[PDB]
């Protein structure tokens, strides 16, 4: 698949991903905050289509993600990210996708997620997050 | 003058300023690096004309600023930044302006300058720098 | 249990913990690096005994932890940390304790674990990690 690396910004204003209840996470795009102004991130798209798009609009800067979690599992022989859930200091968005497989979770006690990187083929194969004060 | 704040970035690729040998620094603009892509910062213009332009094109990322020094002092009754010198690991750019008054220097032993903010009227009234690892 | 918070340091030199395969993690103590000097952290002791002692002596600063993973689950009705594994850029230490329950993992692509905080009663109830460049 295609690897992506958004790099680091000053925060997150919105997450736009897509998923399919039978497979996994498909597309992933973030509208970051860059020094007080929105910065529209690159849309990282699946090589296939047919997913359900979702928009998570955060009340930035008062609202921010505090925990990211989800599931990794097999889909047609590939270990990929099947589900994601973003929990902010104000609400929970998700789960989006199939909550089956092996769970993972990243609670943040102090600090902020300020960037994403990973790789997407037919589905989101893996991802990492930039963290900063 | 008009206050400006570029914010923080990943690094510095080029600095475009203007100065007058009898007065102080005028225009100030920066092309930063934003996660690998040049970021054209807004041009912060003096309210008056009469300056000599200077383009400082760094060989990013191997070349980076290690010290910023200059002079402040009154011009037409205003305490302004009269001179600037940028020293990188490869060379020295400046002094630009008038080397007289109260000197100041910011040597960086570890870290990088990643943003500028300040205020410009007829001249650069003052400026501050974002620092990061 | 009794809460503990070692705070942040320059790095990690050695981790001394104990565990019991029938139950969970017990004692936890860390010798951190404080600006070049070993800093002997306090020994956060389990209220009970019968644990198997484990000393993880890192070849600091060449060797550093790149991933901490483990399992959380119920022991005598308490949700605790049943197992831990520390992978460095050189070796994998663990798993210590039974690998059953809900998995969790913190791989680090860039940066360092520089502190630990948590709570210990009969077993390690929970813990967080300080991260830094």
């Amino acid at each position: 698949g295609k690897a992506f690396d958004d790099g680091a910004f000053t925060g997150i204003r919105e997450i736009n991903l897509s998923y399919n209840k039978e497979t996994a996470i498909g597309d992933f795009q973030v509208v970051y905050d860059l020094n007080g102004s929105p910065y529209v991130g690159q849309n990282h798209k699946s090589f296939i289509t047919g997913f359900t798009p979702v928009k998570i609009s955060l009340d930035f800067p008062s609202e921010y993600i505090m925990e990211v979690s989800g599931y990794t599992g097999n889909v047609s022989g590939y270990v990929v990210v099947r589900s994601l859930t973003f929990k902010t200091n104000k609400k929970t968005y998700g789960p989006y996708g199939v909550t089956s497989g092996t769970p993972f979770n990243l609670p943040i006690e102090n600090g902020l997620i300020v960037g994403f990187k990973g790789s997407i083929g037919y589905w989101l194969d893996y991802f990492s997050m930039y963290l900063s004060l | 003058g008009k206050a400006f704040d570029d914010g923080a970035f990943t690094g510095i690729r080029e600095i475009n300023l203007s100065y007058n040998k009898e007065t102080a620094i005028g225009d100030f603009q920066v092309v930063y690096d934003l996660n690998g892509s040049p970021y054209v910062g807004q041009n912060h213009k003096s309210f008056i004309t009469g300056f000599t332009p200077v383009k400082i094109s760094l060989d990013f990322p191997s070349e980076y600023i290690m010290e910023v020094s200059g002079y402040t002092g009154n011009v037409s009754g205003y305490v302004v930044v009269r001179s600037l010198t940028f020293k990188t690991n490869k060379k020295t750019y400046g002094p630009y302006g008038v080397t007289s008054g109260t000197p100041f220097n910011l040597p960086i032993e570890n870290g990088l300058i990643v943003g500028f903010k300040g205020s410009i009227g007829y001249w650069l009234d003052y400026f501050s720098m974002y620092l990061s690892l | 249990g009794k809460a503990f918070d070692d705070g942040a340091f320059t790095g990690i030199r050695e981790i001394n913990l104990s565990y019991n395969k029938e139950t969970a993690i017990g004692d936890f103590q860390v010798v951190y690096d404080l600006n070049g000097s070993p800093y002997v952290g306090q020994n956060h002791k389990s209220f009970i005994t019968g644990f198997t002692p484990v000393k993880i002596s890192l070849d600091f600063p060449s060797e550093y932890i790149m991933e901490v993973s483990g399992y959380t689950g119920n022991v005598s009705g308490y949700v605790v940390v049943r197992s831990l594994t520390f992978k460095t850029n050189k070796k994998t230490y663990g798993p210590y304790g039974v690998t059953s329950g809900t998995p969790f993992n913190l791989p680090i692509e860039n940066g360092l674990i520089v502190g630990f905080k948590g709570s210990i009663g009969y077993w390690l109830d929970y813990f967080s990690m300080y991260l830094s460049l």
Binding site: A8, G118, Y126, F127, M129, L131, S132 | G11 | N110
Partner: peptide
């Protein structure tokens, strides 16, 4: 180098 750095955790997935 002249490139700023940031803590990165992950990846999760394959």
């Amino acid at each position: 180098s002249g490139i700023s750095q940031t803590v990165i955790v992950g990846p999760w997935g394959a």
